[PDB]
């Protein structure tokens, strides 16, 4: 997958080569430093002079200042690459995530698709800011240090290189054993704590049995076992500290003592021995840090397969519409449509339904509250495709009209009309470009929204603050109705609350003034039967099939599947 | 606090004094080491001989071995103190988190009252062990190091003490500024992620407007602000590294050069210069470690307050009642009780109810399906207190009796009878010990619990696996029904949920043996109006006063609110 992660850095090679060059300079400065420290000490003790001027100068000016400056500049350019990579991953992932067909969002969760947008992209940008930085820096420094301490005195080099594996071996053995015993104690305490968790979380029954003493005592037993487990963990820790400490001591004193014999023999200088000891410590620390960072880098490159998982997934439907004639009537028809989801294809919610809607006239819908009525709402909004059948808007199917045009000639208001945390002069005129104020005023009046709006804390621009949860259901549905009416839509798809505790004048006036005195091929989805009393063609349905048509007077006349419900209401 | 926290270590004084002494020894050895290292280098350079061998000995054996062994023993004894303190706190906390009156369990949560237990007692023991370890160790070692590097050469100590505060001040300044800018960048990225989250989490209403593109654009610009906020953070990081590095360098080079002149002038000996530089490094490291760890210690004692608020919180309702007669009659009478909650004391959910149960005679209780009927069982089980009224039980009220004897005379069967993770021989004697297994199977046959026990995959003594889901509704109902008979209770209580998943076999076994044949003053709080199949009395009340009594044939005659329920339902 690293053939991809390169391609999302290809517009950053300028920053990358600048940062890499200054990284290499920083490492070389910090690995040429100890040799000249050794030359300084040797200039003190061997030739007692003021050659120390020139050597302290060589240390302080070029090597030290160069290391510090290059370190700062490498830090700067890597922070810049971090932010630019973060921004471009977030933008590409979103812009190709918000263009999937809705069944995508029905399958996958929402907390997961926000984890994969904040935390995962943070990890896959730290993979290039931090971990590759540290790993490459310390690799260059380790190579430099090894070559130096070979050039200085290869006897001590051979000694310490036969030495370091012994330290690593004993430390790793005892550390792994102690870690195992520590994990065992942690698991024992959690298992012993789950009993207290349950007896706390179900205190009613225990109270009913007067059995609290025999829960304190079982906790005392299930804990008093952990102590006898823990003594062994203490002993293992003690022996681990002894083992690591004494092996490190033996290697270090062997180094210093062989070095002493060399310096007295006359095969080195005091400066080169001090240089060798400092190089030994630097090599130890750098080996430690390189060994540490591999966990983080493995975790990062594992996280880099969640972003690229979604950042290019082909959508399963195309919005290939082209037509957009400005003049419609609104002949919503259905041609034996049967529809099922993509989540459970064997169950059925609509079977060969074929019912029409007369232009410019109300046409409600109702069912047994157990069959699929909402599914006709979700099919007409062109969310999901169809299995069998076809739907058409004034002759041509809805698969042919232009996308924004199609959802501008239809509308929707629903059971839970969500209002995004914005201004109410924006929530109303949501999807269409900045229509002026007076149209919004006429719209809010035409849904009894303008009533309360002027009585809020500012009027129209009262942004729906407090994380967008301040308004109540009545104003909610009325402002939603205002939102659909702004577009002047030839069709409308309306839904009604199950409690129906609102003013309720809006729906009857929609059957009377809002949609009856104008071209509005309104459809209704009614749970509360307070609107059955007036309609045009109540097409009651069940099991995904049409059973009755015509006015609900004939439903009362042919009292099948409907007259049973009106007695269930009273 | 600190005083009680000390009072919960009082049994550990032996372990504490032993570990403290060994901590002192380890710190003293590790601070005596570098002086003798400097003496070794001295003997290499100044008087080139094998007088070095004495000093390599006095470094490798005494100081190094002693330091490492003492560190091992200190680590071991602090692990033992950690586990003992953790155990004692958890035991005492759970001992006094189960003896509180149940209103205290209603008010508080249950996720908190386990997170508190586990993680907070972990923190309180971790405070003492880990951080008093680190703080006390580094205090002793820093005192020793300062005394030495004053003993060696005082001009050098005065120069490095003019040096270290300047390093600390410059690092402090620039680190504060850089952390400020990094925090602002994190906040801006989180804000833009929230504006993307409100569109991910509300996809359907967005799709309804063909408004994904403007959402992608809003996200793009809300990101392209972060880049401009981030360049300033890059410059802050640059200057932070430059400032810290250059100050540290100037201090170090001034010290090394002044030491060079000191060695040239005969004022010192090169071994003491190496000793002084090693002491400078050690002192810097330990100062940084203490400066890190004080914050963790303060956080630890800030968490250590959450335990002692519950350790000795006195219980509200004390079960000081102490009485247990041999035999009894079993006449329960709710006598003008004035019961009141403590979670919403404005309302009076039960005010002066008056009705008496009869020995062996069923007394069903149903109500208006919204009013307070579910409280009577909690009144009977002596959960909550009561202001006025006295439930007289055979000469004495319930409050006078023994706790265990009380809940051994009375039982209950909840709606969803909670059954903890045990075996189905444990549960059928929860509080009652030393039960013969044939009594268990007999009192399981009396409620038809023998059915799904033998066919379950382990025989009789099957453990309730998967955290209590290997049984179902009617199963666990028959289980709890088997519970309420193993104790031979002269009083019984029952309840049942609105689902009524059992196929009415519960009522067949109610009227079978322990409702008519055996003497059990059965009460019942039944939904769905199913208990009217048979009754020896019926109480229907509302909010404290009883409106209807007598057998249900009077309820047919006195058709108030009752005869309409059987016809409205289906
Ligand atoms: C960083 C900016 C530097 C600017 C220039 C300053 C010039 C003076 C400093 C020289 C540059 C060194 C830069 C990198 C060094 C980092 C590693 C380090 O500091 O290690 C020292 C400190 O490491 C420690 O923490 C020491 C603690 C243990 C003491 C070790 C004693 C000798 C080992 C034998 C004892 C055996 C027991 C071993 C237990 C670890 C080791 O001291 P040394 O005496 O070996 O050499 C230092 C030299 O004399 C400076 O002039």
């Amino acid at each position: 997958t690293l053939q991809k992660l390169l391609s999302y850095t290809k517009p950053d090679v300028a920053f990358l080569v600048a940062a890499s060059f200054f990284l290499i300079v920083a490492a070389l400065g910090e690995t040429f430093l100890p040799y000249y420290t050794g030359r300084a000490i040797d200039s003190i003790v061997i030739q007692k002079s003021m050659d120390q001027f020139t050597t302290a100068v060589v240390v302080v000016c070029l090597l030290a200042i160069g290391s510090s400056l290059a370190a700062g500049i490498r830090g700067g350019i890597f922070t810049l690459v971090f932010a630019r990579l973060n921004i471009r991953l977030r933008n590409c992932l979103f812009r190709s995530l918000v263009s999937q067909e809705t069944s995508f969002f029905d399958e996958n969760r929402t907390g997961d698709l926000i984890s994969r947008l904040t935390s995962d992209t943070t990890m896959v940008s730290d993979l290039v800011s931090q971990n590759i930085n540290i790993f490459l820096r310390n690799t260059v420094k380790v190579t430099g240090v090894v070559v130096f301490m070979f050039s200085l005195s290869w006897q001590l080099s051979l000694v310490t290189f036969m030495g370091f594996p012994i330290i690593m071996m004993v430390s790793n053995i005892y550390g792994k054993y102690y870690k195992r015993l520590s994990k065992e104690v942690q698991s024992a305490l959690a298992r012993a704590s789950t009993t207290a968790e349950e007896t706390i979380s179900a205190m009613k029954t225990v109270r009913s049995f007067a059995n609290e003493e025999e829960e304190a005592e079982v906790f005392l037993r299930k804990l008093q076992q952990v102590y006898k487990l823990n003594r062994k963990e203490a002993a293992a820790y003690m022996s681990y500290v002894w083992g690591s400490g004494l092996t490190l001591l033996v290697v270090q004193v062997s180094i210093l003592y062989y070095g002493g014999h060399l310096v007295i023999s006359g095969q080195m200088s005091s400066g080169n021995l001090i240089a060798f000891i400092i190089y030994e410590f630097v090599l130890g620390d750098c080996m430690e840090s390189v060994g540490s960072v591999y966990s983080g880098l493995m975790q990062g490159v594992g996280a880099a397969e969640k972003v690229f998982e979604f950042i290019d997934r082909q959508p399963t439907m195309v919005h290939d519409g082209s037509l957009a004639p400005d003049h419609l009537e609104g002949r919503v028809d259905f041609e034996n449509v049967t529809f099922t989801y993509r989540t459970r294809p064997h169950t059925q919610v609509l079977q060969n339904v074929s019912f029409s809607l007369s232009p410019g006239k109300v046409t409600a819908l109702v069912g047994p509250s157990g069959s699929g009525k909402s599914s006709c709402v979700n099919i007409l909004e062109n969310f999901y495709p169809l299995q069998g059948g076809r739907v058409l808007l004034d002759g041509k199917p809805i698969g042919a009209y232009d996308h924004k045009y199609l959802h501008r000639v239809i509308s929707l208001v629903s059971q839970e009309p969500v209002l995004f945390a914005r201004s109410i002069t924006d929530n109303i005129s949501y999807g269409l470009p900045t229509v002026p104020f007076e149209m919004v005023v006429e719209a809010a009046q035409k849904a009894n929204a303008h009533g309360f709006i002027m009585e809020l804390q500012d009027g129209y621009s009262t942004e729906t603050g407090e994380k967008g949860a301040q308004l109540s259901g009545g104003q909610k549905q009325r402002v939603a109705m205002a939102r659909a009416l702004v577009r002047n839509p030839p069709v409308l798809i309306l839904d009604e609350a199950t409690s129906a505790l609102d003013a309720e004048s809006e729906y009857l006036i929609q059957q009377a003034i809002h949609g009856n005195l104008q071209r509005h091929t309104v459809l209704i989805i009614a749970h509360r039967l307070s609107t059955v009393e007036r309609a045009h063609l109540i097409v009651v349905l069940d099991k995904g099939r049409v059973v009755q048509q015509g006015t609900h007077q004939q439903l009362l006349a042919q009292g099948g599947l409907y007259a049973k419900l009106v007695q269930r209401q009273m």
Side-chain angles (χ1 to χ4, degrees), chain A residues 32-43:
Chain A
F32 268 68
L33 185 45
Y35 177 46
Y36 283 92
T37 310
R39 172 146 320 177
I41 301 283
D42 166 86
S43 176

Side-chain angles (χ1 to χ4, degrees), chain A residues 130-147:
Chain A
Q130 179 140 34
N131 279 1
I132 285 300
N133 167 45
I134 279 171
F135 170 79
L136 211 67
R137 166 165 85 251
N138 281 7
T139 280
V140 167
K141 204 205 277 187
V142 157
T143 292
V145 158
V146 163
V147 160

Side-chain angles (χ1 to χ4, degrees), chain A residues 108-119:
Chain A
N108 317 105
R109 275 195 44 81
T110 309
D112 173 81
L113 281 182
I114 286 301
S115 177
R116 279 194 220 213
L117 190 63
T118 83
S119 178

Side-chain angles (χ1 to χ4, degrees), chain A residues 406-473:
Chain A
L406 174 80
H407 293 238
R408 205 185 70 205
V409 310
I410 318 177
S411 313
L412 186 133
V413 295
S414 164
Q415 302 301 93
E416 181 46 282
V418 199
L419 301 180
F420 303 121
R422 298 181 185 182
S423 87
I424 297 197
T425 182
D426 183 69
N427 265 322
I428 289 182
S429 69
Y430 182 81
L432 77 170
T434 187
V435 168
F437 213 85
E438 63 270 43
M439 270 65 57
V440 193
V441 188
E442 300 154 56
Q445 287 169 15
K446 279 172 67 183
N448 300 337
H450 184 84
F452 51 84
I453 280 301
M454 314 310 293
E455 284 85 298
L456 266 297
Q457 57 266 4
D458 211 316
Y460 269 99
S461 284
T462 71
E463 172 276 314
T464 313
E466 49 261 57
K467 57 152 290 292
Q470 52 170 86
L471 266 297
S472 85

